[PDB]
């Protein structure tokens, strides 16, 4: 049938692609990557996401149909589209290897600036020095500095209920270094406690479609393995994050 799809890019522009109506996310993604000029190396570093809210975007699963999501969230107004291209990478050294690829650097740079604006990357103490690199468009230098801040390449999920808290919610934060749960109220106001699970402690993990839950079983210190249920509507994205983190850990090619 062939239909139109608009997708937002990290530099704040959008691209339009013609695709078959029933294209799945990877087919749309490859059509976009070719159109914007990604090569065989760079294409592995980005993915298709849906804008859920101002503060959260969720990765499209392989069995989704991006045209369905597009039409369903479409209006005559709406600043663009709910589909967006974002980086999909937890290991920051792999992206340092791309400092000589203009496309990658540009996309990494624009998404990082927006991720600072939104609070994901805690860059406050060097806000001025980053701002002058931003002003001079010293993109690699800006990124080389920013990659040393807290929250670079961390996925933060919206607060939700957890079966291992009597009262209150958790905000989960997934990075290459560990899986973190931040305690907060049922409103989403940060309490002040943080549990940090090492990936080595992770025994198994799973989803519960019926119960709308992501589950993980951890073994800590010396105690018996235990299951924790996080009641997030984004259990499939969370599950994809675990799969991706262990993949990047196996293929880690650096001691630092």
């Amino acid at each position: 049938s062939d239909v139109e799809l608009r997708v937002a890019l990290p530099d704040g522009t959008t691209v339009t692609v013609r695709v078959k109506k029933n294209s799945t996310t990877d087919q749309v993604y490859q059509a976009i990557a070719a159109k914007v000029g990604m090569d065989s190396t760079t294409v592995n570093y980005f993915a298709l996401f849906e804008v859920i809210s101002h503060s959260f975007v969720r990765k499209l699963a392989p069995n989704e149909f991006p045209h369905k999501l597009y039409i369903q969230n479409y209006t005559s107004a709406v600043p663009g589209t709910c589909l967006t291209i974002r980086k999909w990478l937890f290991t920051t050294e792999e992206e340092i290897l791309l400092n000589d690829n203009d496309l990658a650097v540009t996309y990494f740079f624009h998404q990082a600036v927006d991720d600072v604006k939104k609070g994901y990357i805690k860059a406050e103490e060097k806000s001025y020095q980053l701002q002058k690199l931003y002003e001079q468009r010293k993109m690699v230098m800006y990124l080389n500095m920013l990659r040393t801040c807290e929250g670079y390449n961390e996925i933060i999920f919206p607060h939700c209920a957890c079966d291992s808290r009597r009262k209150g919610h958790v905000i989960t934060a997934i990075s290459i270094t560990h899986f973190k749960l931040h305690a907060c109220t049922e409103e989403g106001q940060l309490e002040n406690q943080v549990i940090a699970f090492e990936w080595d402690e992770m025994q198994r993990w799973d989803t519960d479609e019926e119960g709308m839950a992501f589950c993980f079983e951890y073994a800590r210190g010396e105690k018996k393995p235990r299951w924790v249920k996080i009641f997030t509507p984004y259990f499939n994205y969370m599950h994809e994050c675990f799969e991706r983190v262990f993949c990047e850990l196996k293929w880690r090619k650096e001691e630092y």
Binding site: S164, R165, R166, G168, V170, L181, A183, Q193, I195, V228
Partner: peptide, 4 residues
């Protein structure tokens, strides 16, 4: 119970 609570891990928190």
């Amino acid at each position: 119970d609570d891990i928190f």
